[PDB]
Amino acid sequence: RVLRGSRLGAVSYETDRNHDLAPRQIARYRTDNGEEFEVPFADDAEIPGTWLCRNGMEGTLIEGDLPEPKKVKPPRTHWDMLLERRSIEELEELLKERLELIRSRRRG
């Protein structure tokens, strides 16, 4: 009869010890627009120099640890889409025909 539900998460019942914790470092992070952010990592924890902060952007670490700059590639350009079907000499002949077209526009 009664329809029941469960939000898919675990609920335990323990003591909130504010005294007996795992000790922990705090890493300061600096974003692109100079925003400071102090992420609490654990003690036994590798600190990534990059971190998506609370700002909604990427915030690098406040030290000069030199993370990897790009490790990426450009997606594609309209010129790449153009070059997949046409020749460089084809586009250069079109460039010369539009040069003559602007010549007829200008002084012809």
Partner 1 sequence: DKIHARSTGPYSMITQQPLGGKAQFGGQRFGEMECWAMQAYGAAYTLQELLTIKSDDTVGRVKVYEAIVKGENIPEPGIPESFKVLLKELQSLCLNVE
Partner 2 sequence: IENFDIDAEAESLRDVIRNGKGQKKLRALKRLKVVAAFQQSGNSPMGMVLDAVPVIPPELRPMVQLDGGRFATSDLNDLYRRVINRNNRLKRLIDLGAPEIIVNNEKRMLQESVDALFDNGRRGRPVTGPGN
Partner 3 sequence: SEALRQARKDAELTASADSVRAYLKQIGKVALLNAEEEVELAKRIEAGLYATQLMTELSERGEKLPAAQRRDMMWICRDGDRAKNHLLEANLRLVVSLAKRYTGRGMAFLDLIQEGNLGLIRAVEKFDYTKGYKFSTYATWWIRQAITRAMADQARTIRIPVHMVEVINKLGRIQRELLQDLGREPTPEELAKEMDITPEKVLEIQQYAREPISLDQTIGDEGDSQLGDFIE
Give the residues lining the site for partner 3 (CB under 8 A). Answer: 2-5, 78-79, 81-82, 85-86, 91-92, 94-95, 97-99, 102, 106
Check residue 10 for interaction with partner 2 (CB under 8 A): no
Strand-pair partners of 59 = 31, 51
Check residue 40 for interaction with partner 1 (CB under 8 A): no
Check residue 22 for interaction with partner 2 (CB under 8 A): no
Would you give the DSSP letter of residue 2? Answer: -
Minimum CB–partner distance for residue 8 and partner 2 (Å): 6
Cβ atoms of 83 and 90 within 8 Å: the answer is no
CA 97 to chain centre: 42
- Tell me which residue of 72, 95, 73, 71 sits closest to 82, measured CA to CA: 95
Binding region for partner 1 (CB under 8 A): 1-2, 4-5, 7
